Structure 1
Amino acid sequence: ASSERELYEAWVELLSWMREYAQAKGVRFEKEADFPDFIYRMERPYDLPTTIMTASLSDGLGEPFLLADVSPRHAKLKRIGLRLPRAHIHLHAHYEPGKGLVTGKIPLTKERFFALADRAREALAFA
């Protein structure tokens, strides 16, 4: 589907946000892991945006308080997710033509994200 294309195109954006928010709020952003789907890619194809698959916003000591990750190009039931460590909170973002990136029926806007990252950083930050 062309839907897959967009998802990743979105994941790249979502990431951009995390970086924006980290450098902006003085909190450390870190690439946690790249796609094995790529590390072990060999003379095979790959036209996907980034190699980055799991990012995060960690505090002073490091412990993450926001985890973002998209599913590899070879998985099924693709989705990009958000997870708040320590506090049972998981978010699944899907892509929809027109309406865009939603977490069900509600859109996931830059604003919303930040607000989420914010609240999360506020409460879970150990340092």
Structure 2
Amino acid sequence: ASSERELYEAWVELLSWMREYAQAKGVRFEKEADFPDFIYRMERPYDLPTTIMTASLSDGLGEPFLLADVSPRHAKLKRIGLRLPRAHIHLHAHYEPGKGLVTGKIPLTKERFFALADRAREALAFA
């Protein structure tokens, strides 16, 4: 259906939170990779709101501890994903209408993500 749209919109919203945390704890954030269907679209028209697909929070050593990704424009089984490297931790969120951004059945709010990234910073970050 059309929920996809808001999902990408919601996806953009997610990025904001990430950036905010960067200023809070003074930790390095990096834009990892942009959309291929936006680089390699030559004349084809493009309606998506933002051009960024993958980003991450890297520690002082540059090694990431938190990764966030969004599904491409034409792929099947679209989702938004989160991963903690080296910790065997994967989260798979959808956008359910009325509820909001939810990890499966459980809502994914700003506070939950802030806590998760703070835990990763305290635990996994080497320096």
TM-score norm. by structure 1 comes to 0.98
Encode CA deviations 1:8-35: one digit per residue, 9 max, x unaligned: 0011011010000111110011100001
Encode CA deviations 1:31-82: one digit per residue, 9 max, x unaligned: 0000111110111111101110000000001000000000111111101110
Identical columns (%): 100
Instruction: Provide structure 2 residue ranges, at least 5 long, that are not aligned to the other structure.
Output: none
Runs of 4+ in 1 over 3 A off after TM superposition: none
TM-score norm. by structure 2 comes to 0.98
Equivalent-residue separation in structure 2 for 1:88 and 1:11 (angstroms): 23
What's the C-alpha RMSD, in Å, of the aligned pairs? Answer: 0.7
Equivalent-residue separation in structure 2 for 1:4 and 1:31 (angstroms): 23
Equivalent-residue separation in structure 1 for 2:118 and 2:49 (angstroms): 27
Encode CA deviations 1:95-121: one digit per residue, 9 max, x unaligned: 111011100111000000000011111
1:125 deviates by 0.4
Equivalent-residue separation in structure 2 for 1:95 and 1:109 (angstroms): 11
Equivalent-residue separation in structure 2 for 1:49 and 1:80 (angstroms): 16
The number of aligned residues is: 127
